[model samples]
Target: PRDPLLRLSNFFDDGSVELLHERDRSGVLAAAGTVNGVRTIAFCTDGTVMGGAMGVEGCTHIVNAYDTAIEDQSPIVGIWHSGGARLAEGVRALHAVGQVFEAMIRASGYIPQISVVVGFAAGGAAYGPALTDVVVMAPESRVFVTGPDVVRSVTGEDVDMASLGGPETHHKKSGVCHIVADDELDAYDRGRRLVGLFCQQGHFDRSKAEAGDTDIHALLPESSRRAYDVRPIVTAILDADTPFDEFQANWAPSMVVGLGRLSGRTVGVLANNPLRLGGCLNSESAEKAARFVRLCDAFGIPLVVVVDVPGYLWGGVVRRGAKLLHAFGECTVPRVTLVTRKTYGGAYIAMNSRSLNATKVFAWPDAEVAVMGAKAAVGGVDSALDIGVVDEKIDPAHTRSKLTEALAQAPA
Candidate 1:
C-alpha cells in the first residue's frame, strides 16, 4: 500500500477493495487510513509528498507506530516509497531513519513486520525493506543504498535504478527478500500469507489430542530394509494449521531442514532420510544440521533429530580432519535424538551423541545402535579392523557380538 501522497498509488490501487477493515488509524502517522483492514505505514520517497522525504517527524512517527505494534502484539507493514535520505532536512532526517531502523529490529521478536517497495527507495530508505521480516516488491519497485546522483557524485559512476537497486540484486544475491511478486497486489497477498504463518492463531498445538490428523506411523516404510520419505514425519509433527516452513530445502537433499511448531511452540527439526544411501552422513548434511541446531538453541527452540544413519560416508576427502567432530560439538540446543533405525559409526556421534550434551535420546525398538553394523564390524575387534579377515572359523557375526558386549556406549 503506497502512501496516498506518493507517486506510486497506482501500484496498490486495484480500483476496488477486496475486504473491509475498521480501525482507529488517526494516531498512526505516514500510514494509510484503511486498506483491507491493515494499516500501511510509509517511508521516504522523493517524487511525491515532499519529494518522498523522511524527516525527523516522519521517522519518529513510524518508530512510535512500530512500538505500538510490538506493545499491542500486532503486525507492522511498511509501504516504502522513498527517493533517498531527506537532503533538505539534512542529517536530522537520516538520524530519524536510524531511530526507526533500531525500532524495526526490536519489533522482530514480539510482532511481525513486512516491507513492500512500490517505487524508488534509495539510500537509507532501501535499508528499511532489507531489514523487514519479509520484503515484497511491485514490478516497478527499485531499491538501492545510494541513488544515481549520489553515486555519480561520490564514485564518479553513472548507474540507473534497475542497475543499482533491482530485483536480481536482492532476490538472488543477498536473499534480502523472500519472494519477488509479479505486481503490487501479488506482493501484498504474499506478505499477508507470510504474516499469517507467524501469527500464533494459525499454528497447531501438539499438547492437545487433536493435532493434525496425520499418521506418522503410516508414512514409515514397512520394511526396515526399504527407505521412506521423511516429509510425512514433519507434516505430522508440525502445527495442524500451517505447512511446515522448510528453509534451504534445495541446498541439502539428503537432510531435511526447516522450522515448525510442536505444541504451538516453534522448533527446528532435522531428519536424515535413509532413502539416500541409507541416510549415510555426508559433508553437506553435517554442515546444515550443525548450523540449524545452533540456531534453534539460540532462539530457545528445542531441537529434534530423526536419525536413521547407516554410517559416515567413508573413503573420501570428508574422512580426514576433525570437520565432523568439530561441527557436532558446536550445537548447543536442548538436543533430542530419536533413532529410527541403524545408527552406526561416527553417524551416531554426529547426530547429537550423548557426549555432545544432548538432553534426550529416543529410539524405536527396531533401531540398531553400534559404531558400525554387525556385518561390517564382525570378527572381533582386531578381526573386524582387519579388512581382509575372511575365515569361516572367525565367523564375523560371533566376533561382533563379543566385541559389542565388551564395549557398551562406544563401539570397538
Candidate 2:
C-alpha cells in the first residue's frame, strides 16, 4: 500500500528513503532517508487503515523510528494523520501509544523531533505532536483531545472541527504549532525546510553574512513609549532568504523566540515583542523563553537576544519570572544580547546580560540599558558601560556588521 512510504518518499532525496518496518494493518511505516542531504528517520501513520488508529504494533513502529534516530543521532520527523489509539484494542492500544510517548521523552534534547499534522490528530495523536520539539500544521489539520461530537456530548456545546483544533486554534491560541503552512503540500515543504535548517546550520562567517538592505531602525516607532512589532527588526537582522522558524510565536508573544541563520550559522533569537504585553516579561513568556533557551543550548545553537523590555510585568511574581533568569544563567552556549531600546531592572539581567555571562552585550546608541526605565527611575548607558554590562555601543545602521563580528567570534 502507498499509505506510508509512497506518500512521503518524494519529501526525501531521490531514492534515499528506504522502508524499515512494515506490518499489515499496523497503520504505521518507519523509514530511513536523507532529507536535504542530512540523514533522517521519518515515520507516517496510514490514515487509510481504520482512520490511522494506532495499536500495539503501530506504536512499536514509531518507537523503533525513535531508536534508529537516537543510534544514528539524526533528526526524526513524524507525519501524523491519526484518529488516536485503536479503541478495538482498548487499554493495550493506550499502553502502546504511551510507550511511544516514553520513547519521545527519552529522545528529547538529544535530537530534533519534528511533527507534521496534515489531518485530524485527535486524542493520542494530538499529544504525540505536542511532545515533539516542533509541530507544523497544514490548513486541513485539526488537533484536539476530543472531536466536536464528543465535545458536544460532554459539554453540551456545538463547535466545528476547524474552530476546535484548526491552525488558528493551535497556532494562535494553544501554541501547539510552530508553523501553519498554506496547505498539505506546503506543510511537507516546511517540514523538509525545517530539517534542512537544523542539519545544515553551516559555519559562521562574518564576511559572507551581509545584512539585508532593510532599515531596521524604521521598524520601531518614534515614541519609545509606543509599542510596535519586533518581527520586522528581527527579519532585518538575519541573513537574506533565511526564514525565521518561530516557536511559540502566538502564545506568550511578548517574548519572541525562534531559530534563524546569522553569519551562515544557526542562532536562536529571543526578543521582547513590544507589540504584545508592552514587551514585559511575564510568567508565560518567561517559561516559554526558558524552554527555548535550553533547547538552543542543548543543540549547540548560539543565542541572539534582542532586548527592548521595560521590566518584568508589574505584579508578576518573582518566582515565576526567575525562570528566565535561571534559563539564561544556566545556558553555556555563546549568547549575544542586543538592547534595541530599553533594558530595565531584573529583565535586563534575565535577557542574557553581561551579569548572566552573555558572550557579549551590545546596545544601540540611543538604547537605555538601565536598572529601570527613565519614567520610573533614572539610569544611563554610561553606567551600564562603566559597570561592564555593555560590551559596546552600536549604531542601528551598522547593527548587522557589528552583530556579524560578534557572532564570528563565538566558539565553534
Candidate 3:
C-alpha cells in the first residue's frame, strides 16, 4: 500500500500512533506513539511516492522525527524502503539527506535509534540504517550503496540484488543487519520488542521472580573438547517464554550478544558459542562483543557474561581482542561472569574476569579457569579462590539462583 503512516502505526500499541507531520508527495510520514507502552517516535517512507525517493521535503520530515525523539527522550525508529535521494531534486536532495545524517549523529548514544528495512534501501537510504544502533531486515529487504545495475555497469560485476545486499548477505557476511525477519510485519514486531527492552527494562527483583526450570549443565557436551551451541544454556539462564533479542546473530556466530530478561529485569548477555570455531574469540567477535558491552553500560543496563571460550583465535587480531578487554575495563556498570566451561589464556582476563574489575565472578565446580588449557594450566576452583578471582564455586543446578542473587544486587 505504500502507506507510511499505516506502516508506522502497525509497530506501536493499538490507537497509539498520532500523526505529527505529513505533506502530500513528500514520500515520508512521521508520527509519535507508545510502542509496547513505551513512548516512541517513528517514520516511514511511502514507496508509492516517486519510488519512495528522499527529496528535500521528505528528508526534512525525517529530521523532524529525530527532533521529536530527542525532545521526548524516547527511542526512534525508521522504516526505510527508499531508492535513495530524489534524482529530480538534484543537489537539494543530497544536502537534505546529509542533514538527516547530522541529526542522527547528534542523537547517537543518547537515545536508541532502530531501522527496519522492509524493501530496497539503496545509496543514502542504506547509510541511514547503517548509522542506527540496530538494523532489522525483512526477507524482501535489500540494502546497498549501489544497486546491481550500477555495480555491473561500473565494475563489470554481474550480481543480482539479492546476492549484492540481501538479508543473507548482511546478516551472515557483512554484519550490518542485526535481525533478519521472515517478512515486513515480523521486522516491525522485532523493532517493537527491541524498544520495549530498552524502554521498560524493569528493576531487578529476585524475590519476586521464580528460578528457571531448565538444567543448564546438561546443555553442554559431556566431552570438553566437543563443540556445542551456547544458546540453549543462555535460554535456560534467563526467564522462560520471554524474548531474548539477539543482535548480529548471523554475523559472528562464535560470539552471542543480546538483551534478555533475567528474573524479569533486562540484562545484556554475551556468551561464547563453542559450536563456531570452537567458541574461540576472533577479530570480528571481539569487536562485536566490545560494542555490545559499551551499549549496555551506556544505558545503565547490567551485564551477564557466559564464558566457555578456549582462547582468542590465533592471528594478528590481538588488537581487536584488546579492544574487548578495554571495553570491559572501562564499563562501570554492575557486571558478572559465569565460567561454565573452559576459560583460558588472555581470554580469561578479557571475559570480565576479576582482573578486569568485574563486580562478581562465579564459576561452576567443574569449570576450568586457566591461563591456558586444563592440561597445561594451573587454575581450578581452589586456585581461583586463593587468588580471590571468583566469588563462589557453584553447582550447575544452582546456576539460576546464584545469577539471580548476583543480578538482584546489581546497581539500579
Candidate 4:
C-alpha cells in the first residue's frame, strides 16, 4: 500500500526519504532522510495493519534501523501510531521489542532520538517514546499503559482515556511529552526543530549581541516578597532570531529550561520561576532542570541560567539535588548565570553560582548574592568583590549582549 511512505515522505525533505528495508506485513516502515540538511533515520509503525502492533519481523526491523543510525551517527526519529504488542506472537514479540529497547539505550546519548506520536501509543508501544530523549505528542495522540476496558477491570478507578493518557495528563502531570503539538503537522515540525538543536547546531557570534540601554529590572516588583513571571525577562535576554523551544513547560514550571540561539549559536536558557512555589527549588524542578543541564552539556550547548531563587521548598532532594550540582560542575561546556534579582540558601549553590567553576556570573546592580537572605546575607562585590563573588555587575538592559558574549567565549 502507498500509505506507509505518505507520512514518512512528508516528514522529510522532499524526495529525500527512501526505504532502507521494506517487506510487506512487517508493520513498520523504515527509512533514512535529510532533515534540515542533516541526515536522519526515521520509521513509522503502520497503524492500519493489526492496529500497528509490534511483532517479530516489525520489531526486528526497528532494531536494524537503530543500528543503522548508530553506525551513521545520525539522529533517529520515530512516528508512533500503535496499539502495542501483537497478541499471538507473545514472548517472541516481547523479545523483539526488547531488542529494539536495547538498541535505544545503547544509542541514547550518542545521537538524538525524537518521537512524534500522531496516534494512539499504548502498552509496549507507549514505552518506546519514553526511552528516547524527547517526545512530541500530536493533538490526537494518546499514550497509556492499558486501555479503558483493562483499567475498568483492574484499577476500578473508572477513568476515561483522555484523563488517563491525554496530552494534558502527560504535558502537565507526567512531563512525558516534551511538546504537545497543536496539530499533526505541528508534531512533525516540532520533531524537526528538536533534532536540529543537536544536529544543525549554529555557530556562535558575539557580534550579533546588541547592547543598548535601560530597565530589564523593571519586570521585578518594588517589594522583593511579591512574585512575578520570570519569562518576560527570559524572553528579553534570549535571541529572537531563533525560536526558544521550551521543555516540559507546564510541569514544575517553577523551573524553566529550553534551547534557543544566542546570536547564531544554540544555547540553553534556564531560570527559576517565582510565579510558582515562590521559585522554590524542590525535587521535581531539580530533576527537570538537572536532566536539562545534563542534556545541554552532552550536546555541547552553552547555558545561560537566570537566577531568582529565594530558597528551596525545604524538601529525593538529597539525591535529586545532588544531580543538579554534578550537572552544573561537570559541564565542560560554557555555563553562565544571570542574577536578575536575588538567589539565596543552598539553592544559591544549586543555581550554578560562580563558585561552581561557571564561566561567568553576571549579577545586575542591586542583585543579591547570598547564602541566605537578610541584611547579613548578601554584592556586586562593591562590598564583597575582594572574595570574587560577583564577576561584573552590568546595566540591566545590556544583559542580552552580556549573556550572549559570555557564551560566545567558551571553547566547549
Candidate 5:
C-alpha cells in the first residue's frame, strides 16, 4: 500500500502461525497484527473465498484478535469489510460482534480504537465501525445499518441504503465519522492525525509567552445607549495582541464567536455589542451564543461573559420568539459575569441571579438591581402604603426634625 498510515511492518505469510489464517469470504475470519509501532490492530473478514459467509474458523479469528489487542498495551484498529456472518455458522459468528463491543466499553479512555468504513459495511458491520473512538469514511463507501430490503419487509418504510449509513450521512448528522475525505487515501491521512491528537499525554500549556494585558473598557461608551464596539473588549481580554477569530461570522453580525487565552489558559468569550441591533437576542445571535457555549464546554474551556444590556430585542416576531429564555440558558459553562451597565428584569436573573453557575458576579456602583426604574418605584411605593409611605406624613412640617422638640421630650 502507498499510504503512510498502512505502514505494516510485517506481511503475514500463508498461515505461518495458528492465529494467522489464509482465508477470504468464508463469512467469519480474523487476522490480528500490529503496524506503525501501534502494537495492536486486527482485521476481521468473512472469507471472500467462502462467499464471505463466516464459519467456525472465521469466528475463531475475530475472537482471538480482540483478545490479543486487550492483552497488549495498545489500541485496536478494525478494518471491517464483510457481508456479515455465515448463517450456516449460526449464533456463534453473531456473538463475535457482541464480544468486540464489550471489550471496547471496558477499554474506553485506556486504549485508543478506530475503524474505517469502506465498500459495503452492511448489517452488523455498520456497528463495528461506530464502536471505535473515531470513524473515517471513504467517498465511495456506504454503510447500511438496516438495508433497503429489511426496511421494506420489516417496517414498510422503504428507504435507500446510503440514508442509513452513507459517508455523507454519518459525517455530519450521525457524528459517526468525525472526518470525511475525498477518497480512501485522504481519509486515511486525516485519520492518522486524529489518532495522534487523541493519544497525547498532556494538555497544552498557554503560558509560554507574555499574556495579553490590554484593558477593553475604553471601547464601551459611558452612556448605555451610545453604541460602542465589543471586539476591542474581546481582544484586550485575550492574551494581549491576539485577535479573536470568529466562526460563522456572516450568519450572526450582532455578536462574535471565537476562542481566546486568559493568562496562558484558553477560554471562550461572548460579549454582546450594543452597536448591532441594540444588542438584543435574535435568532442568529442566539445560535451564535449557543455554539460558543457548546464549544467551551466540549473542550473543557471556561467561559467569560461580558454583560452590558437591558434585555432581549422587542417588537414583531422578535418578541414572539422563545429565544429570550432559550438563548439565556444555552450556556452550560462555569460562567463569570461583569455587569458594566444595567442588569434588569429577566436578563438579570438569566445572567447572574445566584444561579446559572456563575462563579462570581461583579457589579459597578452605577449598576441597578431592580424590577423597574426610580420613576415607577416612586408611584408604586406611594400607592402600596398610601399616607404612611411618605416621610412628610410621619414628621409633618419637620426639616431634619429635632428628636427632643418633635415629640416634646417624650411627653415627660
Candidate 6:
C-alpha cells in the first residue's frame, strides 16, 4: 500500500481520510480523520517513493500535522516505513528531519502520539517513533539506526534485521516498542484503542464502580513469605472484563504498570508483582515505575497503586531511587495508594505515600508501614493510622469501590 491514502484509509474511520497539504512527490501523507469518533490526526510515509526517504516537503507535512493536533488538543498517529534521509536531498533532508523531531518533542506531553511500524524504519525514522509516547510494531517491522547491509559495510557485524531490531527484540530486549501487535491490522486497531483511551475517556459511576464479584483478598497467598503474581489483583480492582493489558510486561516483571478502565474511565494502574524480585524496588523497576508515573500524569489520567513491596533493593540503589521520589513528589493527578500487605522502608514513600502528597493513602487490614520492619517489624494498620501515616484502613474485598470514590473526589 505505497499509495499513502490506501494505507491511511486502513486506520481512519470507515476507511476515509481528508488530506491536509497534499503533495504528490512529498512521499508523506497527512490527514485528519475520526478515530473511535474522536477527531485525530494521522500521517503515513509513501514507501513506494524512494523507499519513503523523507525530503524537505515530506518533513514539512509532518511538522504541519503536529501543529494541527497540538492546537486541536487531539491525538496523533505516525505510521512509519522510511529509510532515513533522501540521498539526493542530502544535508537538506537531515535539516528537515530535525524540524520534525523538534515538533514531536514540543508536543510530547500535550497529546498522545502513537507510532506504528509496519516495515523498515531506520535512522531518523527510528528516532521519530522513539520520541513519541508509545510505539507499536508489527511482526515484520524492523527499526534500527542502520540495516544489516549498512552494519556489515561499516563494522562487519554479521546479523539479520530480525535479530537487530525486530518486534520481539524491541519489545522484550531493547524496550524500544511498547507493544507487538498480531499484524498490521491489529497494530492499527491497537492504536485506535489507545487513542480512545486517551481521548474518549468513559465516565465513572459512584454507586456501581465497586460492584464486582471477585474477592481481592482471595488472590493473596496464605503465608506472608509466599510469593503470588499481582496481575490477578490488578485486573480484579479495575473494571472487570475490560481490555486491560500490561505495559512492558516481559522487561520488568517486578513493577507492573498498564492503562485500563476504572469505572469505565481511563486510568493508569501500578502494582508490585512479588513473583519476581519479591516485588522489591530496584534500579530497573524504580526507573520503570517513574516513567509510567510521569506518563499518566502528563495525560491527566488518574492512577491507582497497589503496594506490597518489602523495601528498596539493597544490592546497589538509591541514586536511582531518587527518580521515584521526584516522580511521586511532582505528580498532580488523583493518585491513590493501597497497601495490601507490606510496604516497608523508603519503598513506602516511593509508592505514592502521603508523605509525598498522594490524594489518599489506604491500607488493607494489618498492612505494615514503617522505616524498616522492627525485627523486620513495622507499624500495624492501627498504629499507622494513629501515627498519621495512613489515611484509612480498607476492607480488601471492597478495594475497587473505595478507590473509585477516592479518585473521583480528588482534583487533578
Measured by TM-score, the strongest candidate is 3
For residues 237-288, what per-residue lDDT tens digits would candidate 4 score against the true structure?
Answer: 7676567889999999999888887776778888999999999898889989
Q: What's the distance in Å from true for residue 275, model 4?
A: 0.9
Q: Report the CA-based lDDT of candidate 4 relative to the real structure.
A: 0.85
Model 6: CA > 4 A from native: 150-156, 314-316, 374-379
Question: 1-412, model 3: which lDDT tens digit per residue?
Answer: 6688778777788899888874577999888989877889998988988779898988898898899899989999999889899987899999999999999998888899999998889988889998888899999889999998989999999999999999999988988998998888999999988888888888776654444645679888889778998999988888877988888898889999999988878889999999999899899999899989988987878899999998876454688898899999999888889999888888888999998998899898888887787556444877897889988888888787687788777665
Ranking 1 against 4 by TM-score, winner:
4
Better of 3 and 6 by TM-score: 3
Tens digits of per-residue lDDT for model 5, 72-191? 745555554556555665787678666656766665545666665555666666676766655667776666666788888999987676776677776544445545667765655544
lDDT (C-alpha) at residue 241 in model 6: 62
Itemize residue pairs with steric clashes in candidate 4: 381-385
Clashing pairs in 3: 345-371
Please give, for residues 1-412, the per-residue lDDT of candidate 6 as tens digits.
6677877888899855788875587879999999978999999998989888889999999999999999999899999888888978889999999999999999999999999888878988889999998888988889999889989999989899999999988887766788789998898888888898888777777766856635688889999889999998999988776778577777767999989998888989999999999999888788778988999999988999999999876433676689889998999999999999899888888899988998898999978887777775534889999988889998887888888899999865
* Candidate 1 local lDDT, 179-263, one digit each (tens): 5777766766655554444443222233332323444455677887788888776656555665576644544446776666654
Clashes of each: 11, 1, 1, 1, 20, 3
Q: Model 2: which residue pairs collide?
A: 345-371
Model 1 segments beyond 4 Å from truth?
A: 4-53, 73-75, 106-111, 116-121, 132-172, 179-183, 197-233, 239-241, 247-359, 363-412
User: Can you give the lDDT of residue 66 in candidate 5?
Assistant: 62
lDDT of 3: 0.87
lDDT of each: 0.57, 0.85, 0.87, 0.85, 0.51, 0.87
Tens-digit lDDT track for model 2 on 1-412?
Answer: 3377665785677889888864567999888989878999998898888888899999998999899999999999999889989999999999999999999999998999999988778988899998988899989888999999999999999999999999988887877787898977788888998887777878877666653434568778999779999998987888777888888688889989998888788889999999998899888788888888988887888888999998876345476577778888889888888989998888888889887899998888888976666666743677788988898987777777677778678776
Cα lDDT for residue 330, candidate 5: 56
Q: Name the weakest run of 10 consecutive residues (lDDT summed) in model 4.
A: 377-386
Better candidate number, 2 or 3, judged by lDDT = 3
